[PDB]
Design a protein around this ligand. Structure first.
Ligand SMILES: [Zn+2]
Lengths: 159, 76, 177
């Protein structure tokens, strides 16, 4: 009964990035914490220099990923990487062979690592098409839910 | 000599090496303790991506130095 | 005939980013956080679409006394530039609730980094009141009816929250219950 909790900024960052990349795939890293055996919090995400096509994406700059993580510490985000995200513009959420090779390298450093996939095309008002996965190689889907009063009043200011 | 290799996920790994070691062979020395292919490792130190050809003497990496491991990020 | 900048729109993400910054630096109710805002400031309407946090510390008691990491601004903005060239550095933000005696001096500092007169966005993270928790300001130097002296002053610009389709989906999703 394990759940991935995606903060508001994380969801908006991933959706905004997915839609901007269209018709290309995009990706980025996910910061968060493993609170307990049943709870993974994704508080934040960020995108590194990358190249993509309609059916692939890869990170280019690797210095950037290191640097960025120090900048955030300096500004109060002490959370570490819990996983990664990329987009499937138009063809749903699942893990490809390429994504498994990347996900297992993640799970080697943290057996609780997570891989999120969002579809910017199928995501529409009233239907957000996103999913979180992990391996054991086959893979399985983790339930996704969302956590605060401060964020909620702030969001209600739109309309 | 003892060095440290911290990852972006918080887990830190300790390695014992010698300054007469190529960056190509250091990545292999990482695959032994965690299983990550060298081709998927990107080594960073003092803002520099370590190149496989050079040695620790080219980067002046002394004992108890801290490296940072970034992974190859590939999605399809 | 009239100033160019008449209106400001803010993306939801910017508001949530300012709030996350204030929460994660555990800013004590007297204290405030400060960061950068990015977007497009060439049309009449200034579009605030992204942001990032800054290292910032101030004296609780005095106004002239503060530190703003010059190097961080330069470092983080160049990073942003690689990821998105459209979102240009247009000004700064803090958590308010209102203007502070030091904001005009802090604003002069950002004039170096913006192609236009900088925009100060205050985000009242404690969200007291009806009406948007945002106020937008640009500094101008007005000739007081002296009529030769001048008086550097913040000019208020009205605000609205405008979301792209992706943010609109995300927000309606988040506002599920
Ligand atoms: Zn994929």
């Amino acid at each position: 009964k394990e759940t991935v909790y995606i903060s508001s900024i994380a969801l908006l960052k991933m959706l905004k990035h997915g839609r901007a990349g269209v018709p290309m795939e995009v990706m980025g890293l996910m910061l968060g914490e493993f609170v307990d055996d049943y709870t993974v919090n994704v508080v934040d995400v960020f995108a590194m220099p990358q190249s993509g096509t309609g059916v692939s994406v890869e990170a280019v700059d690797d210095v950037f990923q290191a640097k960025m993580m120090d900048m955030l510490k300096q500004t109060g985000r002490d959370q570490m990487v819990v996983g990664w995200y990329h987009s499937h513009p138009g063809f749903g959420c699942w893990l490809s062979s390429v994504d498994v090779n990347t996900q297992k390298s993640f799970e080697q450093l943290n057996s609780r690592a997570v891989a999120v996939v969002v579809d910017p095309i199928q995501s529409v008002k009233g239907k957000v098409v996103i999913d979180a996965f992990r391996l054991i190689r086959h893979y399985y889907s983790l339930n996704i839910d969302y956590h605060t009063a401060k964020e909620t009043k702030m969001l209600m200011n739109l309309h | 000599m003892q060095i440290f290799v911290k990852t972006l996920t918080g887990k830190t790994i300790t390695l014992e090496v010698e300054s007469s070691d190529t960056i190509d062979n250091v990545k292999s020395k990482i695959q032994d303790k965690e299983g990550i292919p060298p081709d998927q490792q990107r080594l960073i130190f003092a803002g520099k991506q370590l190149e496989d050809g050079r040695t620790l003497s080219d980067y002046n990496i002394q004992k108890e130095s801290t490296l940072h491991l970034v992974l190859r990020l590939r999605g399809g | 005939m009239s100033l160019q900048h008449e209106k400001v729109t803010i993306a939801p993400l910017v508001l949530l980013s300012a709030l996350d910054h204030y929460e994660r630096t555990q800013t004590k109710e007297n204290k405030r956080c400060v960061g950068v805002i990015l977007g497009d400031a060439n049309s009449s309407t200034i579009r605030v679409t992204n942001s990032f946090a800054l290292p910032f510390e101030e004296d609780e008691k005095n106004s002239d006394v503060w530190f703003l990491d010059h190097n961080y601004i330069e470092n983080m903005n160049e990073m942003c530039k690689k990821i998105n060239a459209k979102e240009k550095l247009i000004g700064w933000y803090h958590s308010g609730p209102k203007l502070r005696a030091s904001d005009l001096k802090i604003n002069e500092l950002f004039k170096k980094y913006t192609q236009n007169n900088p925009l100060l966005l205050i985000v009242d993270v404690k969200q007291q009141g009806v009406g948007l928790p945002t106020d937008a300001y640009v500094a101008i130097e007005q000739v007081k009816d002296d009529g030769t002296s001048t008086e550097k002053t913040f000019l208020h610009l009205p605000c609205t929250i405008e979301a792209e389709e992706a943010e609109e989906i995300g927000v309606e999703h988040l506002l599920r219950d």
